[PDB]
Design brief:
part of a larger assembly, 4 chains, A alpha+beta, B alpha+beta, C mainly alpha, D alpha+beta, B: alpha+beta, two-stranded antiparallel ribbon, two-stranded antiparallel sheet, about 15% helix, D: alpha+beta, 3-stranded antiparallel sheet, elongated, RNA-binding, Ribosomal_uL22_bac/chlpt-type (chain D)
Chain lengths: ~120, ~55, ~45, ~110
RNA sequence: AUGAUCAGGUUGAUAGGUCUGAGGUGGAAGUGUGGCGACACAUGGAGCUGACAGAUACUAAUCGAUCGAGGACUUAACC
RNA sequence: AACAGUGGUAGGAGAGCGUUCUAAGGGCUGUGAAGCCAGACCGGAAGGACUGGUGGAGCGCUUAGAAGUGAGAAUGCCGGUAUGAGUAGCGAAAGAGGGGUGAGAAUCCCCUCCACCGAAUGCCUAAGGUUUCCUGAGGAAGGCUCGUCCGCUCAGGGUUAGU
RNA sequence: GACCGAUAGUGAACCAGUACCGUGAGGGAAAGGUGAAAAGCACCCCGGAAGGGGAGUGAAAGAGAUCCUGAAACCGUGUGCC
RNA sequence: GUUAAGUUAGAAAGGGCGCACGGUGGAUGCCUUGGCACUAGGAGCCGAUGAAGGACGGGACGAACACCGAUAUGCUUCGGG
């Protein structure tokens, strides 16, 4: 199955969308474990989507990820930065574009942190 | 929904005999020097599985 | 859920003020016994 | 044979004793490791005063870092802070905020 | 519920990807045609797909550590 | 010496024990009194010695007197501490991510998205409160967690009317 | 003073008719003791501090800011026997 | 070392009982700045020449007690020292 993440579907979907946009933004995420585990699959299907790289693909990925700024001097938005750079970088490895590194838990609540980076 | 009698000392300790908390599992870091959890990256050396992580 | 105490300085000093207590004879006895008691705040 | 005490650090003594008993009678150099790698409330406090305890060797009678072990150590109650948490029906229940004394006595072997 | 059980942990298919499917929703976008028009057609059972089943070492199950045997009297029987 | 007797509530009688003062006589005490703590001592009882440790200045004894004179219970009263129990609760709500401070960061600050209210959860202004306002420091207590933070603490500063 | 010695004795030995409660009349607490002298901890180490460990003062530091003595409830730590 | 069936120490996750050392808490002992009840004496009123009792304010910083009153932590003028 798939986790609930302690919130209903609306802000859950908003949460995952926001995290995966952050992933494409800075190629490295610090967050808790279970957010990382359910993060991996979704960002890597968007990576498959960008590898597909056609116009139906552009509109599909537009319908999920959100428009931040990703490279401000080139004004590169997250969609185009994905669809140009990262698909060309990882076009060859037919899956598994994500890594999980686990860490010690936080001081505040003992929530198990994880390191997410795209590699 | 009320304790009918006070709980005596040995009953109290006998209940608490399982409430002790276990040790974590340590393993010696890939980078030398110190102690680390299993499957967690190193806090001090900042490394995991031999590889370095910033 | 209007509680039992609404503050009003004017009504408070009108009904428990020093002039109000001195105006009556019985209030004068109240002042005298409070002063004999030695209260810091002696009248309202 | 060195001793350091906590002397009323604001923490429940039971919550202290739970992480505190697991370092009883083992080598200090790894005891500090297991204790700062277990996540508890008490772990930084006992970490701090334990490092002070071993640190009683610098301007102190001389022992050395290795071959050194906890001899005996325990957690002792301090004076309790009375606090009154308000409660329904205007009942005004009472809560105790406890304080604790933590002792570490460490000797070489 | 957590414990627990079971499948697995690099000589490996345990889980997630990728590809192929089942099945379900059902005719995607973008084009072009007809039409003033809302629209209907072809591209094309197209497009999409959570849990489902097969392959695939792509990513994660790494280095570690801890526990855990050495065995008394008699009757039978033979070193 | 002999004989007999010796359960016991309400009750009645007789013997006593102990405490604080007060007189009389005696003496004990920094070479350690009172009190406290621990002992396998003595008497029929209430109780009373002895020896250690603590303690660091007052106190027994003899005889008599006078009592605020003896606690286990009164849903007694006051103070302290247990039990529940590491339990219930943590007081309507969408954040997340990157930077920065810091000894420590889910909770502080900066930024980008997202979300909520919008005849209001916006903007004025009564009653009322009385510095809670601002600036700079700090984090023992208050903050139902944390807190480098503030409506908390500390040191300054701030309210100008002929309409 | 054959009166009390800090749950006593005035409510009040202590900034008490205070704090606090009540709209008001009114009600009404708790809270004494370092040392002879502050001689009240220079200096060092841990630490952000607090707090400790040392060094020093004293007759005493277990005497270090509810600081004479420190009973009991309660709570811990080693253990002889089970 | 095989039988076979018999007999028994042994343990401790923890605990119970004794001992020792702690902390908490402030009983007890000791002490008194206070209070109670009296004895002997004095005194038994103050106030428009503004009382009792307060508010405000006064000091080399500022709070509170206490003292005082824009002459404000006091002054003049007799005595003691």
């Amino acid at each position: 199955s798939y986790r609930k993440l302690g919130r209903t579907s609306a802000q859950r979907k908003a949460m995952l969308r926001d995290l995966t946009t952050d992933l494409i933004i800075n190629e490295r995420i610090e967050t808790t474990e279970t957010r990382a585990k359910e993060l991996r699959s979704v960002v890597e299907k968007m990576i498959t989507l960008g590898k597909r790289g056609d116009l139906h693909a552009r509109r599909q990925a537009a319908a999920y990820i959100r428009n931040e700024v990703a490279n401000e001097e080139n004004n590169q938005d997250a969609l185009q930065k994905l669809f140009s750079d990262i698909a060309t970088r990882y076009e060859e490895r037919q899956g598994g574009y994500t890594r999980i590194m686990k860490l010690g838990p936080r001081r505040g609540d003992g929530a198990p942190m994880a390191i997410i980076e795209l590699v | 929904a009320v304790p009918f009698r006070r709980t005596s000392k040995m009953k109290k300790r006998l209940r608490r005999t399982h409430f002790k908390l276990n040790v974590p599992g340590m393993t010696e870091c890939p980078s030398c020097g110190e102690m680390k959890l299993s499957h967690r990256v190193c806090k001090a050396c900042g490394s995991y599985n031999g590889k370095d992580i910033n | 859920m209007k509680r039992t105490f609404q503050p009003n300085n004017r009504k408070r000093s009108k009904v428990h003020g020093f002039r109000s207590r001195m105006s009556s004879k019985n209030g004068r006895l109240v002042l005298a016994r409070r002063r004999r008691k030695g209260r810091k705040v002696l009248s309202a | 044979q060195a001793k350091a005490v906590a002397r009323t650090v604001r923490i429940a003594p039971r919550k202290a004793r739970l992480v505190m008993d697991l370092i009883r009678g083992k080598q200090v150099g790894e005891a500090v490791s297991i204790l700062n790698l277990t996540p508890r409330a008490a772990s930084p406090i006992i970490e701090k005063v334990l490092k002070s305890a071993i640190a009683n060797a610098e301007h102190n009678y001389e022992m050395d870092a290795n071959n050194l072990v906890i001899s005996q150590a325990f957690v002792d109650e301090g004076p309790t802070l009375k606090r009154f948490r308000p409660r329904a029906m205007g009942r005004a229940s009472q809560i105790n905020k406890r304080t604790s004394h933590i002792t570490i006595v460490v000797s070489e072997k």
